[PDB]
Each structure stands twice: as C-alpha cells, then as structure tokens.
Design a protein around this ligand. Sequence first.
Ligand SMILES: CCn1/c(=N/N=c2\sc3cc(S(=O)(=O)O)ccc3n2CC)sc2cc(S(=O)(=O)O)ccc21
Ligand SMILES: [Cu+]
Ligand SMILES: [Cu+]
Ligand SMILES: [Cu+]
Ligand SMILES: [Cu+]
Length: 502
Amino acid sequence: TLEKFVDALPIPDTLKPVQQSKEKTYYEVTMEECTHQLHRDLPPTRLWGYNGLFPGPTIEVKRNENVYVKWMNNLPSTHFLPIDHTIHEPEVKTVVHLHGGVTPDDSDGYPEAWFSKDFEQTGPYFKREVYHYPNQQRGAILWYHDHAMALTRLNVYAGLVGAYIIHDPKEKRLKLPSDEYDVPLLITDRTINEDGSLFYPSAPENPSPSLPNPSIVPAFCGETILVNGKVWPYLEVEPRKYRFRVINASNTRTYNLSLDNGGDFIQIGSDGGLLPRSVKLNSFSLAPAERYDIIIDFTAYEGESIILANSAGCGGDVNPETDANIMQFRVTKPLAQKDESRKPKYLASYPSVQHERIQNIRTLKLAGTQDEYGRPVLLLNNKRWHDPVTETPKVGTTEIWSIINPTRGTHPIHLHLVSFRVLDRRPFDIARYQESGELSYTGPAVPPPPSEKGWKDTIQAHAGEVLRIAATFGPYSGRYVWHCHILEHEDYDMMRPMDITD
Ligand SMILES: CCn1/c(=N/N=c2\sc3cc(S(=O)(=O)O)ccc3n2CC)sc2cc(S(=O)(=O)O)ccc21
Ligand SMILES: [Cu+]
Ligand SMILES: [Cu+]
Ligand SMILES: [Cu+]
Ligand SMILES: [Cu+]
C-alpha cells in the first residue's frame, strides 16, 4: 500500500470571475475529464473535474454578493464508472448543487434538472444554464458537487466536488486566522488500482447471481484517504494558529478525527456558520457532507509531525496502516509574520434567541424494502423518490421534524435550502417499533452537545434513536429535496422532494 505523507497538500486556487462589477459576479466552470497524479508513486488517474481540477476550484464570496455560475458539462458521452441501469436519455447527466446554498429553486441543482454535454438534452425540471447564488445567508463553509438523478454517487466519486466559502465582513473583527492561514480540507476516501485508475465497485462482494450487473451497492468504503486530491498528504505549517474548513466529501465514510500528539481542535463553526461559542474538542465525528470550521493552534508544537488520525471504521475497524490516517501536519515553516489571529470564545448570537412558533411537526421514518433482485432499497417514510410529494412546509414557517431511525446504522440527513437547530436525540425500542409501529422510549431526551448548538444542515441520525430538529423554511418557496447524504443510499432511493409552498 501507498506510503503515507510523501506529497504536499494541494491548496486549490481560488476561482477568478469571468466578469465582476459591484452589481454582479459571473463565473464559468466547465466539467472535464482530466488526469492527475493522486500519489508520488502512482501513474496519473483519469478523473472528472470542475475546470479539470480535483477538487474543483475554491470559490470565495461575500455575504449578499450577487453571484452567477454557469456550470457546463464538457465531459465524455460515456461514463467510466459502473452504471446500474435498474435503479431508475443520455448516459452522462450532470447537475451542480451548492450544498448549504440559500438558493432559488431552479439554481439549486435539482436531481432532475440535469443536463448532458453542452446542454444538448435536459431533464424535466431544467430551467436555466447560469445558476444564481444571491448568498443572503450567514458566512459559512459550503461545498459544491454533482447531484444528478441516480448518478450522484458515481459523478461525485469521479471527482466532482469543490469548496465554496461565504465571508461575512462583520466576522472580520473576531480576527480569526485568515488568508494563507485559512485552509480547506476536503476529505475523500478512494480505492485506487495498481495502474492508478479509480476503482468503484461493480457489484457487492459475493454477488447473488440474481443481481444485475452492474449493481449499485449500499455502501462504499475506500482503501485510501485523500485530502484535497492527494493520498495521505502532509502540510507544512508555521508554529501559530490556523483555521481549517473541514469538509467530508466522501460517498459513505464517516470520520472520527483526532491529533496524535493529543492536541485540541477549537471548533468555531458548523455547517450553517459560526457557533455562538467556541468549543475545545479532543475528537469529533464528521459524516458525509458535514463541515467543521476549526482552529488548530500549532504554537507549542514547533518541529513536530502531527498526524490527523481517524478512529471510525467503515465496513470494519480502521487499519492503523491505512484509513486510521488522514494527513500529517509538519510544524517546520518559519513565521512569515507575528500571529495576530485570535481564538475568541464569543463568536455569534445564539440560535435559541429566536422564538418561532411551531407551525407543524412531521414524523419521518428511515426504512426500506427489498427489490426483485434481493437488494435493500432505502426509503424515507416508505416512499420512493417518484411518489407524490409529502413534505410540503409553508414558506416562512417553522417545523419540528422527528426522524425515527430503526435501522442498524447512522444516516446523515440533509435538508436543502435551510439550516436548522438540533433539539434532542432519544433512544427507542426498535423491535417494538418494527412489530407494531408504536414508539416507546427507553431513556430521556439528550440535548445536543455544544458542537450542535449552532446551525446545521446535515445531521447524524443514529440507530435506535429519534432525532428532533427545528427548521424555518425560507426565505424562498419552490421545489427542493431532503435526503440521506450517504450517496449510495441517496441514489436508491433515500431521497424525497420537498415543496416549500406559498
Ligand atoms: C443498512 C445500510 N447499510 C448497508 N446496507 N446493506 C445491506 S444490509 C444487508 C443485510 C443482508 S442480510 O439480511 O442477508 O443479512 C444482506 C445484504 C445487505 N445489504 C446489502 C449488501 S451496508 C452499510 C455499511 C455502513 S458502514 O460501511 O458505514 O459501516 C453503513 C450503513 C450500511
Ligand atoms: Cu451535498
Ligand atoms: Cu444540499
Ligand atoms: Cu442513509
Ligand atoms: Cu442534496
């Protein structure tokens, strides 16, 4: 296996606009098949990249900056990863979703607003080529990726991901580490063949001969961990405070991260922006699509090599030699200047300041059935994607969603458009729920830890629990989605439409 910590961490370039004025910023991003070396000892890997880059370029905006991005498909007409034709027209369909984006519906990248090369064919919900992001939201770490119906796991695995950072200039005063000392970390697990080509499985192992070929799989666990498009890389840092925007851009894998010298992370931010108060943590779980905005203070570790480690298994216990490792920091870079950054305690106003009336309470179950080939089909509330819409909140109103998970594992549940608050989690009797539908608690409600006291948009719903969240649906109305962000689940078929009505 590949030797750890021999390639420098790439820092993706910030995308430059094609046109910019005070009224409007316009970008163009083209999806391209490209080859890049993922490790010193591999031949170049054929990938699909935004502007031919993996990850895609980092886009940086200000709060309320009036942004447009023409996302274009210039990919080949055939995929290179295995497509299962029985879970759902051109073969290659793409659509770009800005995850976390407070976005009008027709710029949100609905799964059925896909487009093939040069927009030759378009899905039935396509309206526009040039997406509009008015960015009328809290400063935060967002990220962009493909969201095409029934291909999301493949197109994302192929390399279609990037970071998108919204900067609110009212946050400048906190003096958090900035510029060179503010670094995104997009984490993606991959399996890589000897010839350097990506491996994505064609079928579960020990395929029942009942199975079609290719067959979707319910979960994907990569052998190797990349950050910013390199296998187990190293970052030289100066002995001072750094901010990192940590984004789990992996298909299935959840990470549980720590520093091997026992140092602390200082979490300043969640999916939806700055927490009200910074939190000192030794470790943290980060499931697909969650983001953690953290300060790491390398001040006291000059000269040290410090591994960002991982304790969470994927399909097994972590292997100390492989997936127990993420990346390595080397505190050997000389100070370019005095560390004037800060790690304040007092970051933002609490979400609990808000007093909204509860218009409605939805009860949603995570469940599934079995198809004609014997495979698990994962379903939100026992509905298929294609069934008539049932989650129909009214614009401007607040709902509590109770999410009941009687399955064996966690699902990271994600709602488009909004960020939301975490109210609490509560264990329940699974066997009883499965036998009779009746909901009996085995213990009291647990409120969120401080990490979850701010704004979230992707939230881990653990097994044998009920999770309650509270969201205000707005400011736009329209047609959006909600889904498990395990892409293998999402595509079959753990994704529903969500209509925010007027
Ligand atoms: C429940 C969702 N889910 C999986 N489902 N797939 C299943 S469950 C299952 C049971 C049987 S049985 O009934 O014959 O026993 C046969 C086939 C099955 N398959 C098909 C292969 S695999 C998975 C891994 C992780 S992890 O990777 O994050 O640890 C997380 C969540 C996951
Ligand atoms: Cu996403
Ligand atoms: Cu999203
Ligand atoms: Cu799931
Ligand atoms: Cu989504």
